């Protein structure tokens, strides 16, 4: 009984964890979503972004995702402050697998942001969104077969940082970010070998913290600019209030959520071409976590006018 129970627990936990990755895939930061929003003349904007990535964890879990996003905003000009207020829509296709399961998630989201760029070098970014997830996963363990189900998520994220110019052309930028969410629970009930089995998890609420530093060196001409940049951060769960319940003939079993944390590493660039066009690009990975991003690439483009 004990061996059987460990296996089921490991398998259930692996499967249900895709809901955790789903959520984490939609967490980003200002520079990754918007590019560099400093010293922009135009009073309106339209932008787009693509991210592609792969990650992994024990049990042979691997995943990779494609995240597409577009938004539009107005920039209000204030005393030493530009405040961008706008809307955004996102699409994510992700695929995932491990020793005992396989499948795909499809996500559509919408939201609202405000980004506040201060002349002093300070910034605040606030974002609220809703994401709807269609999921299809196939396991072989337990006789669970194929399962389709929906989930949804709410996101409320706040980021602050400060760009200190060490030289006319070199800079350092400490940053802090806090992202609060929700994730809908689901239940499977099925039969295997004449026996009623069951698997259910409650709604839960991620809180994800990040602290880090970016550093940058810029180069310019009259009608162009390029900044090379790099950065080191620490990303960490502050809660793990999820719980899965396994239930069979013999009895119940509760598996509680565990916190994960990882070190974030990245390198890239933001370009300015003439008056309306900006482009940003980063390569990223993480180290030291149960789940790490093994590599990912983010591109964004903004047209300001
Ligand atoms: C932590 C929650 C933060 C929620 C952000 C609120 C920011 C307000 O966004 C307003 C959207 O503005 C639309 C303006 O119209 C542009 C087209
Ligand atoms: C503004 C940057 C501050 C980042 C501090 C990093 C703290 C690292 O925590 C390590 C503890 O990990 C548990 C072992
Ligand atoms: C700039 C600070 C970077 C330090 C981050 C360390 C991450 C610690 O990882 C522990 C995760 O697994 C436990
Ligand atoms: C103990 C391991 C901690 C160090 C991790 C390895 C660092 C070597 O790679 C340099 C990464 O530079 C930062 C930018 O990362 C770009 C991601 O793309 C490369 C993925 O391999
Ligand atoms: C992740 C890609 C990193 C891209 C590096 C930045 C390249 C842009 O630099 C433009 C330099 O303009 C000419 C001045 O020369 C500076 C010497 O350093 C150039 C190193 O490539
Ligand atoms: C290293 C910069 C890459 C940016 C690619 C997009 C540039 C398109 O700008 C064209 C402007 O046309 C006028």
Swiss-Prot record:
Residues 39-305 form the Autotransporter domain. It is a multi-pass membrane protein. The record marks 28-29 as: Cleavage. It is found in: Cell outer membrane. This is Autotransporter protein EspP translocator. It comes from Escherichia coli O157:H7. The lineage of its organism: Bacteria, Pseudomonadati, Pseudomonadota, Gammaproteobacteria, Enterobacterales. The gene is espP.
């Amino acid at each position: 009984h004990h061996h059987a129970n460990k296996e089921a627990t490991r398998n259930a936990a692996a499967l249900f964890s895709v809901d955790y990755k789903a959520f984490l895939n939609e967490v980003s930061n200002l520079n990754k979503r918007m590019g560099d929003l400093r010293d922009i003349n135009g009073e309106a904007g339209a932008w787009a972004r693509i991210m592609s990535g792969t990650g992994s964890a024990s049990g042979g879990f691997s995943d990779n995702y494609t995240h597409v996003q577009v938004g539009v905003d107005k920039k209000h000009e204030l005393d030493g402050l530009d405040l961008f207020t706008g809307f955004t829509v996102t699409h994510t296709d992700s695929s995932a697998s491990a020793d005992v399961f396989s499948g795909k998630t499809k996500s559509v989201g919408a939201g609202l942001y405000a980004s506040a760029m201060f002349d002093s070098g300070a910034y605040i970014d606030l974002i609220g969104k809703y994401v709807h997830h269609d999921n299809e996963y196939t396991a072989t363990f337990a006789g669970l077969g194929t399962r389709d189900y929906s989930t949804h998520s709410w996101y409320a994220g706040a980021e602050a940082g400060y760009r200190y110019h060490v030289t006319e052309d070199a800079w350092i930028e400490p940053q802090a970010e806090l992202v609060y969410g929700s994730v809908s629970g689901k239940q499977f009930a099925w039969k295997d070998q004449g026996m009623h089995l069951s698997m259910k998890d409650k709604d839960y609420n991620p809180l994800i913290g990040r602290t880090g530093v970016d550093v940058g060196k810029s180069f310019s001409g009259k009608d162009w600019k390029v900044t090379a940049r790099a950065g080191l951060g620490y990303q960490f769960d502050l809660l793990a209030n999820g719980e899965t319940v396994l239930r069979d003939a013999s009895g119940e079993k509760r598996i509680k959520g565990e916190k994960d944390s990882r070190m974030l590493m990245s390198v890239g660039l933001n370009a300015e071409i003439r008056d309306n066009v900006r482009f940003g690009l980063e390569f990223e990975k993480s180290a030291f976590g149960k789940y790490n991003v093994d590599n990912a690439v983010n591109a964004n483009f903004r047209y300001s006018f």
